[PDB]
Design a protein around this ligand. Structure first.
Ligand SMILES: Nc1ncnc2c1ncn2[C@@H]1O[C@H](COP(=O)(O)OP(=O)(O)O)[C@@H](O)[C@H]1O
Ligand SMILES: Nc1ncnc2c1ncn2[C@@H]1O[C@H](COP(=O)(O)OP(=O)(O)O)[C@@H](O)[C@H]1O
Ligand code: ALF
Ligand code: ALF
Ligand SMILES: [Zn+2]
Ligand SMILES: [Zn+2]
Lengths: 681, 681
RNA sequence: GUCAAGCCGAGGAGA
RNA sequence: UCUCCUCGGCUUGAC
RNA sequence: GUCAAGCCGAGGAGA
RNA sequence: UCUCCUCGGCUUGAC
């Protein structure tokens, strides 16, 4: 029951007989149908050719793997061949290599394959080789870039092709190379401004993929333009003239703390540049060991983040964030009191709590809650009232807190209730930003609920920009967020409806429409570059792509050269670790060991009788000054407390250039594994 | 008249002089002969050494205990020494300790010994100590795992060995430790994917057994390969395209009930995931006290189980199951009527009975009974016709109902009758799944009847996978069931014949052959891991096994730490128990008592004048809503009615977090024993 | 020698 | 955490 | 089938 | 170099 379209056949025709190539078409153009048809044709050809037929599909998105397996690929080809989808969430209980020789067709994430190849090279496991295959298919080929995963695999492929090229003029025997097929929508521009540089970027993409030609539809293009509809663009801007009674108070607090610190930021409040200056300032303070500035630097960072979220989101979330971390610090102080006075800390607490109550009073004010938020509400109301149950609303924001607060508040707002709108916030799996993480299964359940229509409003982040193919969508909006041309075009290419609306909500002061025009111009420039390369001479095309392949290969070689070791110091115990907030000695480099080369830890009783544990098994570990050190873990049955090096400060025994690494692997010196013969009886 | 073989001597040679070790050989390799020869040699050595000779054999299977005593061990060694086999079925009338010092040789199940040791530690009974022995022999050593019974005993042994290790460098006197011998076929892989992890698993097995070396036959291996024959593999697949007239009606009923409940399973019908979602749903309903959903959740679970058995077995069994539990519920309703109306219950009854009659009409249809079943019939017919009375047929299925229905239906089918096949269903002792339990003596009688050839077809479950040594077997099949590599290899290693057939019957949609390939790969990987460990350095081997012994010891110590009490609440009467299906109060925590610390019960007349009794001495107890509460028992001469806590719902007097424990011991609070001075005159 | 009921822990498979 | 299966141990009772 | 924790690398945006 | 976001992989654990 497989189907195709005239433009699909036109674009895919060269690939039907060799011609490892790329395909670039607008979103919702049946690209996956083209891919499944091409795979079916190639496998039938191989069977008729009495040769092994092995095809892989590679995705950077697990959700895309599952969606492609469920919807478009397996149903058509379930009967003819064997099919399977792999992922981290999927338990690869069988193996990767066996499925390479069991299912005859693979759907996977790139570095499943890459890890198998690395294991093969290291010899730990049998692994796999590209020669084992006959056809590789990649989605979102634009992600093939300087050294991304797709590009890593293709660098191995290109080295093999160069070896073959050496062989052809030297020896007849050669290593077979599987065909390569790429699929994308926007090949992208690496910020190239001159259209010439955009052409060079496109040539780089082709060379990385060994692409013989872009092969975009021209003759049938017309009908495709008629088949695919483009959403109506809509720009919405609001000026932040309100927030004075609350934001001005926050700026007053920040200025008072600056006076207490006697430091000149030389930057506007609430700007991320202020936060960068802070970062530098507390790094300097900790390296110098000085206090009254690093702690205040951290607090100023927190106030800057609060100011930003207030600028985007209402005041109450910023107030809650402030009082939450202040309460955590207060509980740390209480624990420190329990085991056994401060001036800076007491100063901050006293200046804070009163203003915190005042800001609690101010926060609940619907008269001047915000401007952009009011415009967002008016918009959502208008479209959801005009749809008459035909609305699938998508909102894009920047951070976790925005999504969660907006969902909670839309559910609190009575207007969205009487319209009947149901809003659910969506985020990635990784926990961060003090927001409850959403599990992969939770992600899938929410997407399914939106698909069934139970959720008429989905708030999400760049997670939602890519993938998430939905049959019908009418409303897409971007809340004061802007990344680049790609992100914007895929966000806009989602309202798959006869009537579609694109909306942007931006602050008047911020230059977001500048980005939007720049993105428009890059989109226009890319098409001309594609036309130019499509009209190039095949010989010159081949020479340039070969030159760029050499570029990539040599770049990897010399990056490895600069990263063979690049820091070779075998010093087991030549350092002392002190606390960061306060300059108390913690330990030396001898009392520490490693487990599974995975966790660094110290088990000596000297460590044990120094820290404190905060309650809610995996209780966390804090210092005596109130600095957070680490967390309890339970491995081996041992209650070993680990720690984050970022929380501590280094001190060399030779000349002590106090410095912060933020991370273990960054440092040169190795630490031994924990032989646990000790702690016995 | 004892005999041996060259490879047997080769493998057993190290154990003949100390060297507590493991042995791993293919099934039917005379392992029991090797064990009896080794025991004879060790006992002769001890007699020549003028030292006490005590040998134990441990089995996880009572049938294996009896078989080893009857067939291979006692006949050879009846004259030279004293021999006895122990078990639960065997009445250990003498004692365990006396036989430890009476028969000089023991065959037992592991926690006979473990219970004796626990009694010794507690001081209730004299018990036994490992020092009393000189040699322990274990069969199926793979069962020694994270904290299994063999592993429990070996953890005690390893702690004793660590004490000895402390003594050697401190004090000359030491506690003697008996030699350790293990026997198995597949040491197994704990789902380890990297062959390195499989090697770690094997090292874990060795460390748990204090194994000095695997000691697998290499030089004589060749002849063994020639002596042992491997069955011819055969794969059979059928696609479930039929069942529409009946299964579609069942799905219609399920959808109608879902509409009545207004709930979205978001899962396919007939899938165990649906049943898990149900479980969660009625747990939530009962905790919330809401009806119209918990009862319907239970019914949906029953329909899901019916769908599964229909997918495997024909329709009539599912129909019978449905009408049986509906009839039981109807009789409950009639009793409830007798002592003194419902909407949900009436809805379900009315929707059911008519469709039940219709499904009775549909069930008796041989045209589209099933696919996998037809293939099974065709197979069995082919092999039993081609054997010409030389067929010993073994079938493996998943559940009780499958076994019983298949046996009854094979006897009903005229084809198996004209072939003369005799089919008997086999299950475990424990009653469950609404199938008559098969007594241990019934098990033994059936096995004997199969051995004599009176039963040419034995239908069984994982019970039959292990043990059951038969001289001649030609046909082994697996009906749409798949567990792991071990189960599969022991199922395949049973057709002990020159010509042997292995067959698998699987649904096309289900991924069972995926498991089969995975199991093949694990079997291949295990052998390479065994080779690698056999080639290891003895010192590094010793160090790693010592590390793993420490791992096990500390794991047990800290599991005990987390399980010292882990829930310490001495609250006699601080709870109220209500009914589960309906929210009627049953009793409080004061009116209940305990007998033999064994049965919780309430005897107050307030309890008595609330429940109803269903007829067929041990009549069962139901609620007034139709909920089952418990059962009559006769202890002390008292007609005390007990109950299952799983059937009731908890309600705390403090803050009432309604929750389900499913089981008494799980809860913290203790209940007093029943001092029966009351109820006197 | 046969049966019933109940309780304790363990393992494997699935999800 | 749920389901299915498997195990063996312990108590009580009856024939 | 569910959850937690930790680690490895990659990309994009900003500055 | 910093921040924000995004990704996927690996280990351990628990239910
Ligand atoms: N031959 C065809 N005729 C009509 N529609 C098609 C055909 N093939 C695919 N489609 C449509 O294309 C959609 C798939 O879009 P897809 O190509 O996955 O988006 P993207 O290009 O972003 O991957 C399906 O919903 C289907 O309706
Ligand atoms: N020395 C021997 N020579 C020939 N056959 C033997 C010898 N010892 C044992 N056997 C055979 O081995 C069988 C016992 O198999 P067994 O080892 O119990 O299976 P498993 O290895 O699964 O326990 C007996 O039927 C017997 O015929
Ligand atoms: F392949 Al697309 F949006 F073009 F997922
Ligand atoms: F000891 Al076996 F099958 F190998 F019972
Ligand atoms: Zn400190
Ligand atoms: Zn009731």
């Amino acid at each position: 029951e497989l189907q195709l379209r005239p433009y699909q056949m036109e674009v895919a025709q060269p690939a039907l007989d060799g011609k490892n190539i790329i395909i670039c078409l607008p979103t919702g153009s049946g690209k996956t149908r083209v891919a499944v048809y091409i795979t079916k044709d190639h496998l039938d050809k191989k069977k008729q050719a009495s040769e092994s037929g092995k095809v892989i599909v590679l995705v950077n998105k697990v959700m895309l793997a599952e969606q492609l397996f469920r919807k478009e690929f397996n149903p058509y080809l379930k009967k003819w061949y064997r099919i399977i989808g792999l992922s981290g969430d999927t338990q690869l209980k069988i193996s990767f290599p066996e499925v390479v020789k069991s299912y005859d067709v693979i759907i996977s994430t790139a570095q499943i394959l890459e890890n198998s190849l690395l294991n093969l090279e290291s010899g730990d496991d049998d692994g796999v080789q590209l020669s084992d295959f006959s056809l590789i298919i990649i989605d979102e080929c634009h992600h093939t870039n300087k050294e991304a995963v797709y590009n890593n695999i293709m660098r191995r492929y290109l080295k093999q092709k160069l070896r073959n090229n050496d062989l052809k003029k030297q020896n007849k025997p050669a290593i077979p190379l599987p065909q390569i097929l790429g699929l994308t929508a926007s090949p992208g521009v690496g910020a190239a401004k001159k259209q010439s540089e955009a052409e060079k970027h496109i040539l780089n993409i082709c060379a990385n993929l060994d692409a013989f030609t872009i092969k975009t539809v021209k003759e049938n293009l017309g009908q495709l333009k008629h088949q695919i509809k483009e959403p109506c663009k809509k720009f919405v801007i609001a000026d932040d003239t309100r927030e004075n009674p609350f934001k001005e108070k926050l700026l007053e607090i920040m200025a008072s703390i600056q006076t207490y610190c006697q430091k000149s930021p030389m930057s506007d409040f609430g700007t991320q540049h202020y936060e960068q200056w802070a970062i530098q300032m507390e790094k300097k303070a900790a390296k110098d060991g000085n206090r009254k500035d690093r702690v205040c630097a951290e607090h100023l960072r927190k106030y800057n983040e609060a100011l930003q979220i207030n600028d985007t989101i209402r005041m109450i979330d910023a107030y809650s964030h402030l009082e939450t971390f202040y309460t955590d610090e207060k509980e740390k102080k209480f624990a420190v009191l329990n085991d056994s006075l401060d001036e800076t800390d007491e100063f901050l607490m006293n200046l804070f709590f009163d203003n915190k109550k005042m800001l609690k009073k101010l926060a609940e004010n619907p008269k001047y809650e915000n401007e952009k938020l009011i415009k967002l509400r008016n918009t959502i109301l208008e479209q959801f009232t005009r749809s008459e149950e035909s609305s699938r609303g998508i909102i894009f924001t920047k951070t976790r807190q925005s999504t969660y607060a907006l969902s909670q508040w839309i559910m609190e707002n009575a207007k969205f209730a009487e319209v009947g709108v149901k809003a659910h916030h969506l985020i990635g799996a990784g926990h961060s930003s003090e927001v409850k993480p959403m599990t992969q299964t939770e992600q899938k359940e929410v997407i399914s609920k939106f698909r069934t229509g139970e959720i008429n409003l989905l708030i999400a982040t760049t997670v939602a920009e890519e993938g998430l193919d939905i049959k019908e969508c009418n409303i897409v909006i971007r809340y004061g967020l802007v990344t680049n041309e790609i992100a914007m075009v895929q966000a806009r290419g989602r309202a798959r409806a006869d009537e579609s609306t694109y909306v942007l909500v931006t602050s008047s002061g911020s230059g977001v429409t500048e980005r939007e025009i720049v993105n428009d111009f890059r989109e226009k420039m890319m098409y001309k570059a594609i036309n130019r390369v499509q009209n190039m001479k095949p010989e010159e095309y081949a020479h340039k792509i070969l030159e760029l392949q050499v570029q990539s290969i040599l770049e990897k070689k010399m990056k490895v050269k600069r990263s063979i070791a690049k820091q070779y110091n075998d010093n087991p115990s030549l350092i002392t670790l002190l606390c960061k907030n306060c300059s108390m000695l913690v330990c030396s480099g001898e009392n520490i060991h490693v487990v599974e080369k995975m966790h660094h830890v110290n088990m000596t009783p000297e460590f044990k009788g120094l820290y404190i544990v905060r309650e809610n098994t995996n209780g966390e570990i804090i210092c005596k000054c109130g600095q957070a050190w680490g967390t309890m873990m339970v491995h081996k049955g041992l209650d070993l407390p680990c720690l984050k090096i970022r929380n501590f400060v280094v001190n060399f025994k030779n000349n002590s250039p106090k410095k912060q690494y933020k991370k273990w692997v960054e440092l040169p010196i190795r630490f031994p594994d924990l032989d646990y013969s000790e702690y016995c009886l």
